[PDB]
Design a protein around this ligand. Sequence first.
Ligand code: NA
Ligand code: NA
Ligand code: NA
Length: 133
Amino acid sequence: MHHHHHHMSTNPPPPETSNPNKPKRQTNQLQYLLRVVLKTLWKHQFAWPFQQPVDAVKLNLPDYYKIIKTPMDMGTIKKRLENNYYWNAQECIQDFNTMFTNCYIYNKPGDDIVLMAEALEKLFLQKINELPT
Ligand code: NA
Ligand code: NA
Ligand code: NA
């Protein structure tokens, strides 16, 4: 008997950051989402949990990907913006929304990580209220 000792927890593959068959565009709004919105959130005190795909193995969260089925993070968003992956600003905004919502689903009000997400979401909303064009 192996007693399943070899069945260790793993992370899923990360979201794609390039897809040659997906239509994309460089718009002023998308350039702004990278240069201003993402880059200022990236420098924030609370950016660190969100700068890369959730590493459920490192964080000892083996239930994370049992609960969260559409993972998203600012590292993925940053690469998508730099690689010119998006067609429009709303597609990128959707990824930010998924990132924040995933955090609120997996965690509970009052958790340190939720307070971090709440603060970043407030800055995000402030920065995207007005976009170029
Ligand atoms: Na671990
Ligand atoms: Na893009
Ligand atoms: Na703005």
